[PDB]
Nucleic acid binder design. Structure first.
Length: 35
RNA sequence: GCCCUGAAAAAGGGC
């Protein structure tokens, strides 16, 4: 189809969403900033 | 068949 294909074009929407939605991404997979 | 929206590995929508 074209949507499933468009999803590959959504990697920017996914990586932008995934970047701010780790909570909805692999439980226990949230980065932090306190070394 | 082509997309668009959804983050989607839902749900949706237009042509």
């Amino acid at each position: 189809d074209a949507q499933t294909r468009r999803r590959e074009r959504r990697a920017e929407k996914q990586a932008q969403w995934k970047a701010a939605n780790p909570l909805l991404v692999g439980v226990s997979a949230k980065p932090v900033n306190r070394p």
